[PDB]
Amino acid sequence: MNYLEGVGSKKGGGGIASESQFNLQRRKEVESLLSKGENVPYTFQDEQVRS
Amino acid sequence: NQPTNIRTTVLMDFQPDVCKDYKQTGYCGYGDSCKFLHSRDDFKTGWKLNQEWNDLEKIPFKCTLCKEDYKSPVVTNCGHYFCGSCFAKDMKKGTKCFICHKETHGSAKVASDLQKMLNKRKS
Amino acid sequence: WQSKKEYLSGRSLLGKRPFELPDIIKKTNIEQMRSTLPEKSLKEASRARVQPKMGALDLDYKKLHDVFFKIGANWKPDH
Amino acid sequence: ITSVMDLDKLQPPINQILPTLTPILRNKHRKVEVNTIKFVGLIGKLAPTYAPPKEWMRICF
Amino acid sequence: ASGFEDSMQFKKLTHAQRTGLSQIPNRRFTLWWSPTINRANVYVGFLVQLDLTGIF
Ligand SMILES: [Mg+2]
Ligand SMILES: [Zn+2]
Ligand SMILES: [Zn+2]
Ligand SMILES: [Zn+2]
Numbered sequence: 001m002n003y004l005e006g007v008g009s010k011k012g013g014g015g016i017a018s019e020s021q022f023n024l025q026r027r028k029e030v031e032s033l034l035s036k037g038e039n040v041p042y043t044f045q046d047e048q049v050r051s
Numbered sequence: 052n053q054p055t056n057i058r059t060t061v062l063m064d065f066q067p068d069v070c071k072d073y074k075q076t077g078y079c080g081y082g083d084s085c086k087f088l089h090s091r092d093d094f095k096t097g098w099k100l101n102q103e104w105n106d107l108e109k110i111p112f113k114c115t116l117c118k119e120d121y122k123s124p125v126v127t128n129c130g131h132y133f134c135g136s137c138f139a140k141d142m143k144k145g146t147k148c149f150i151c152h153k154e155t156h157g158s159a160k161v162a163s164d165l166q167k168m169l170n171k172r173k174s
Numbered sequence: 175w176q177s178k179k180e181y182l183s184g185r186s187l188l189g190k191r192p193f194e195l196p197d198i199i200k201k202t203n204i205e206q207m208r209s210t211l212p213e214k215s216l217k218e219a220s221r222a223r224v225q226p227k228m229g230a231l232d233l234d235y236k237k238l239h240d241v242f243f244k245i246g247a248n249w250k251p252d253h
Numbered sequence: 254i255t256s257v258m259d260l261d262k263l264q265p266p267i268n269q270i271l272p273t274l275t276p277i278l279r280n281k282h283r284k285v286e287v288n289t290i291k292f293v294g295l296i297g298k299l300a301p302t303y304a305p306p307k308e309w310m311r312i313c314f
Numbered sequence: 315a316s317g318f319e320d321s322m323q324f325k326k327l328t329h330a331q332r333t334g335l336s337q338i339p340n341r342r343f344t345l346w347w348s349p350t351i352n353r354a355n356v357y358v359g360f361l362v363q364l365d366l367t368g369i370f
Contacts, residue, residue: 007330009080013221015328062361076224084334093272103235197297
């Protein structure tokens with residue numbers, strides 16, 4: 001009857017992920033904010049007007 | 052004091068409580084809270100290690116040249132077997148086995164052990 | 175020397191192209207299997223560590239060996 | 254005991270040992286991580302064929 | 315159990331992992347009292363046998 005508690009889990013895989021993985025995620029979003037979402041193109045891509 | 056005259060049928064419990072995520076993976080989301088066993092068993096040496104990165108009869112009875120019975124049989128440095136006429140003729144063209152293509156050097160033993168195993172009496 | 179520029183400075187280096195595999199190696203088909211130029215939710219990645227999935231590259235071992243040895247034995251760079 | 258004794262005659266046996274270690278690799282500390290990684294790599298040398306290859310990939314992660 | 319709880323892990327625990335209660339002490343309590351909590355004399359109840367054991 002441990003249903004009394006109210007926590008749970010989904011049955012998929014192994015949750016938390018690895019601190020290194022969080023930084024990669026966080027440093028992409030920070031460069032998305034400050035960039036105001038623009039896609040700054042690569043130098044080789046053969047030129048969507050840039051800001 | 053369970054009553055004297057009763058037969059109670061055993062009802063098997065076939066459900067194991069094994070936690071299916073911890074049995075497969077070895078990680079269970081729920082943790083120490085999990086309502087089930089967590090016991091972790093694995094199968095039985097199924098796999099065979101072959102690396103791509105890196106009463107058998109091996110004696111044909113009829114020839115590979117005559118396609119006929121071995122007569123005046125011949126042994127090479129392999130387990131190759133031919134007629135005296137067979138092996139002499141192959142060297143007129145081929146350098147090597149008619150089979151391996153390893154170096155025979157024309158080297159041929161009298162193969163009497165063949166006639167033995169081609170006897171019904173062996174030796 | 176006598177250049178305060180530090181030897182390598184930009185004006186030519188701005189436009190240098192990323193890298194091109196030698197043609198013999200490009201025959202091995204790796205170019206297609208892993209596309210480097212130029213995706214996975216963090217939850218779906220952590221699910222991959224636990225599952226995991228096998229045979230990602232589908233590379234052929236006999237082909238790889240020959241490129242360096244049998245076919246590309248004498249392959250030497252152009253200039 | 255494992256390196257000293259023959260594998261085939263190990264009592265637990267091996268195929269039952271190795272899946273018990275993989276959740277121990279998550280044990281942090283050191284004495285456990287060191288002594289385990291030496292045990293797991295032992296089996297990689299001596300008896301690779303027991304755990305199925307998706308188990309070896311669970312260890313590589 | 316007062317000994318080692320602190321160093322389990324830190325950041326890593328999933329919600330259930332961290333908050334939920336461990337079933338492990340209750341299992342200890344029902345192993346120690348098992349032969350009363352499981353006894354055949356019962357008023358109403360049905361026999362089952364576990365899969366590979368002889369435990370009713
Ligand atoms: Mg739920
Ligand atoms: Zn579980
Ligand atoms: Zn012949
Ligand atoms: Zn041969």
